[PDB]
């Protein structure tokens, strides 16, 4: 099916507390496999997935050098951003970065992403054409002009279409046992009263992969959002996700409420009735 | 693989 790979980086400045804490992680569509924490003593890109350990010492020696450059490339980058926004050198700020590639069913390139961020706000983003940019503010238009003096687009464009995709199938085909397969959820319902004739009905669905799932509480063929609480998807830590949907009903009307689960791993959308 | 990085 459709899968993707993402790379997330985070640099958090700290005045007087040493070099800024740099955290960089590598993400496949919904499974993390590599990480790099600056304050760790190893100072090398450490794996976090079993199937990625096949790559030889050249891979780690390459990925270590490329990201340690990014740490210093972003460390000195903040000292420029403080000048751009005329901030205090004793202030604390955060730098964020993300860019990856999505593919189709048979390995076809689908889309390309590249977006930076400064203190939770966008700074510069590569357009969908991958051959132009979009600066957010006037301070970003300075860097946007640079990165236009150099031909940064066709390097990142050739990367998002190339070594991002060309290296992606190597990751998937190494680990087709764990990534390409989908685990359907384990579904059940609970029952919890609060008064003599009013209770809380919560629909449970546990252990599914990936996280895209739809839950809807319907009453006699009519859906309901009023008096419904739906928490965001939460991870289990092993490679599965969880989500519950809540609805408060008065007593005597429970059998009419229906919980429905729609998920990719299920060939048929589930219909649950208490 | 982790791509390159350019300063501002």
């Amino acid at each position, epitope marked *: 099916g459709s899968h993707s790979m993402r790379y997330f980086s985070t640099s958090v400045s700290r005045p007087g507390r040493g070099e800024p804490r740099f955290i960089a992680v590598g993400y496949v569509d919904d499974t993390q496999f590599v990480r790099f924490d600056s304050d760790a003593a190893s100072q090398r890109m450490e794996p976090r997935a079993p199937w990625i350990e096949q790559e030889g010492p050249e891979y780690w020696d390459e990925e270590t050098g490329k990201v340690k450059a990014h740490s210093q490339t972003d460390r000195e980058n903040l000292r420029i951003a403080l000048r751009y926004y005329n901030q205090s050198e004793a202030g604390s700020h955060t730098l964020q970065m993300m860019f990856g590639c999505d593919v189709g069913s048979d390995g076809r390139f689908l889309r390309g992403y590249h977006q930076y961020a400064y203190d939770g706000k966008d700074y510069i983003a590569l357009k969908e054409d991958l051959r132009s940019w979009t600066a957010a503010d006037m301070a970003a238009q300075i860097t946007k002009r640079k990165w236009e003096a150099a*031909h940064v687009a066709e390097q990142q464009r050739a990367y998002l279409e190339g070594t991002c995709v060309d290296g992606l199938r190597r990751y998937l085909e190494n680990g087709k046992e764990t990534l390409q397969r989908t685990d359907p959820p384990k579904t059940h319902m609970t029952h919890h009263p609060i008064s003599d004739h009013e209770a809380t009905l919560r629909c449970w669905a546990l252990g599914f992969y990936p996280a895209e799932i739809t839950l809807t509480w319907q009453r006699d063929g009519e859906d309901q959002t009023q008096d419904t609480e739906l928490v965001e998807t939460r991870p289990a830590g092993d490679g599965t996700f969880q989500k519950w949907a809540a609805v408060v009903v008065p007593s005597g009307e429970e059998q009419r409420y229906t919980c429905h689960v729609q998920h990719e791993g299920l060939p048929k959308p589930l219909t649950l009735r208490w | *693989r982790f791509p390159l990085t350019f300063g501002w």
Partner: T-cell receptor
Amino acid sequence: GVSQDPRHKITKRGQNVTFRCDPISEHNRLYWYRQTLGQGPEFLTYFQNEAQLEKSRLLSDRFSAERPKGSFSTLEIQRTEQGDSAMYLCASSDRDRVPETQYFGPGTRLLVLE
Amino acid sequence: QSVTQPDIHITVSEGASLELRCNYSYGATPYLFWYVQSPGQGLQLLLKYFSGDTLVQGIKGFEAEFKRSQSSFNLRKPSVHWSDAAEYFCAVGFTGGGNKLTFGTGTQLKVEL
């Protein structure tokens, strides 16, 4: 436009060596290479204006390279042996020019003797 | 992840055409360089290409053309001078494998008068 020092050096086997490289101004990257007699250069390491980022694992730990102040580099190889006698190159780049052109220096040829 | 330089030794007469081939692995779109090394001194950069112009005109009358369909970046010169007798290296930098350069096997060229 790179300047290296020295060009030719000769030592007895089993000792340490030290050379310097003064690359171009406003260039923040420094790649070290080792070229045998009449062959393609062999990669050693590269820096980004402060410190060492990558080193060839096929090179032993007695190879020491450092660029402390980010303007000039230093190279130190311990326990000299004739198998390491070759020309050692120093190059610089910008990391802001997308072609990332590397400009090399006049190099330094090493000859070790017993 | 390889660089192939087929022409390993060439000796032509002065004033003739010249072409040196350099083929890389049919993978990504990497950086490309052609360096010359005189017997004594270091390497002198001739030309480079990543912008997107398949034809590149360089120094010393040397011009190079990029052909992605063949994955070749071949050095050319219309009429070789008598001074061009040196070792010619084509160097690439594999974009995903770091900014380090990957050098070729080396071509030793001499010119007869």
